[PDB]
C-alpha cells in the first residue's frame with residue numbers, strides 16, 4: 001500500500017504562486033508542512049516528495065534537497081543531480097514507478113507545481129489532499145488545478161482559524177472516496 005498525498009496552501013482564488021515564489025511567508029504553516037512530509041510510522045523508512053522544477057528552484061539552495069525526505073524533481077531540462085537524496089525524473093510515470101520500486105519509501109508527498117498536482121489528481125495512488133486555505137487574494141499567477149471535491153470526503157475534525165503576520169488560514173483534509 002503506497003499513498004500519494006497532495007499538500008498545498010491556496011488563497012481565496014485558488015492561487016499558489018507569484019513570480020516564481022510563494023505569495024506569503026507563514027513559518028508555522030511551513031513547520032507543519034515539514035512535519036507532515038517528513039514523519040513516518042515505520043522508523044528507518046522515509047517519505048518521498050515529488051515536485052516540479054520551479055518548486056525546486058524556489059527552495060533556497062541551503063535547504064535543498066529537503067532534509068530527511070527523498071526528493072524527486074520532474075524536469076525535461078534539468079541536468080542530473082549527483083546528490084543521492086534527489087533524482088531528476090523525466091515523466092510522472094517514471095517518477096512514480098521509481099518510487100514504488102523503493103521499499104523504504106512509506107508515503108509520496110506531492111508538493112506541487114500545478115502540473116504536478118494535476119497528475120497527482122489522476123494517479124491511482126491518490127489518497128489524501130492536505131489543503132491550507134489562506135484568506136484573501138494574493139494576486140497569484142499560478143493556481144491549484146480545478147478539482148472536483150465531490151470525489152472526496154472532507155474530514156470533520158475541528159479546525160480553528162490560524163493567523164501569522166496578519167494572514168489568516170485554515171486547514172482542510174480530504175480523502176478520496178474510493179479509500180473511504
Ligand SMILES: COc1ccc(CC(=O)O)c(NC(=O)c2ccc(Cc3c[nH]c4nc(N)[nH]c(=O)c34)cc2)c1
Nearest residue numbers: 007008009030033059060063064065066067111112132
Ligand atoms: C530542508 O529543511 C527545510 C528548512 C527550512 C524550510 C523553510 C523555508 O525554506 O523557508 C523548509 N521548508 C521549505 O523549504 C519549503 C518547501 C516547499 C514550500 C512550498 C509548498 C509546497 N506545498 C506546500 N504546502 C503547504 N501547505 N505549504 C507550503 O508552503 C507548500 C515551502 C517551503 C525545509
